[PDB]
Amino acid sequence: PYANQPTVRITELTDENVKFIIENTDLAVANSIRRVFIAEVPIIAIDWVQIDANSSVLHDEFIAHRLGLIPLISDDIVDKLQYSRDCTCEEFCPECSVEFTLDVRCNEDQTRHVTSRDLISNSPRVIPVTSDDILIVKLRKGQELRLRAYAKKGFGKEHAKWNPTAGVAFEYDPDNALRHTVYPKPEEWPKSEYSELDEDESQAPYDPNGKPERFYYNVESCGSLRPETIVLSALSGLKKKLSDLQTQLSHEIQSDV
């Protein structure tokens, strides 16, 4: 009735991808960790946009939606920041938001590409993943775009703009031993990247005593958070949800008894 002792083996570690294997844990635990990668990892993104001038061929909400999807480097100050709901200040403050300024006007005949590089943050650390550049809008001569934007702290449950990761690869039981999927013709299915069987055989022999374990992960960051920090933040957030639920359950038990 006690906790399994999971182990981690990290195979690939880049600035964009972390490929790791978690052993000796439940399938539900692994899937919840995967869901938190997408849903419950806090990340800073633009949520409040106010436009002073927009002469571009894209309307105001178009460019606002494009701005909100621009990832911002939230590696360390995301934990320091507080949700605007939990912040004591009205509107926005530096302890709950990062302000952005955009001012682009096309004066030359050549087309003007408004990029994330033209986003200017009041913080030196929260940068739109520009150490190419994400295109915001193209400006013909005589077209102008000036706006102010505030970046809030949020997670992917509220909006996909706060999804810190690209496609999270998840896999368990590479050679089909638990038969959680049944192949009508196993011979015509490509072998997994983590398959451990020979070319001659298609799937592993059925294991009645087996259970899902050794879950293969490949979390691809979108640049807002380092891909290793995504897993750390996910584990911390899942543990925080469990701890809050435990506190409220303890209060409920004491009150009802």
Binding-site residues for Zn(2+), please? 87, 89, 93, 96
Three-point CA angle 81, 83, 86, nearest 5°:
115
Note the residues at the interface with Zn ion (CB under 5 A): 87, 89, 93, 95-96
25 binds other proteins (CB under 8 A): yes
Burial of 194 (0-12, 13-18, 19+ CB in 10 A): middle
Determine the interface stretch with other proteins among 27-35, 96-104, 170-178, 190-198 (rule: CB under 8 A): 27-35
75 binds other proteins (CB under 8 A): no
Closest CA to 49 of 137, 148, 128, 117: 148
Cα separation, 72 vs 44, whole angstroms: 6
Residue 93 interface partner, choices Zn ion, other proteins, none, CB cut-off 5-8 Å depending on type: Zn ion
Q: Which is nearer to other proteins, 181 or 243 (CB)?
A: 243
Residue 100 interface partner, choices Zn ion, other proteins, none, CB cut-off 5-8 Å depending on type: none
132 binds other proteins (CB under 8 A): yes
Tell me the closest approach of the beta carbon of residue 94 to other proteins, in angstroms. Answer: 22
Q: Where are the beta strands (DSSP E) in the chain?
A: 7-13, 17-23, 43-54, 98-105, 112-115, 120-121, 135-139, 144-154, 169-171, 215-220
Q: Where are the beta strands (DSSP E) in 63-111?
A: 98-105
161 binds other proteins (CB under 8 A): yes
41 binds other proteins (CB under 8 A): no
Q: Which is nearer to other proteins, 1 or 190 (CB)?
A: 1
Site string for other proteins, 176-215 (x = CB under 8 A): ---x--x-----------------------x-x-------
Residue 175 interface partner, choices other proteins, Zn ion, none, CB cut-off 5-8 Å depending on type: none
Cα separation, 87 vs 6, whole angstroms: 37
Cα separation, 228 vs 217, whole angstroms: 12
- Near other proteins in 79-108, by CB under 8 A: 85
CA dihedral 24, 29, 33, 35 (to 10 degrees): 140
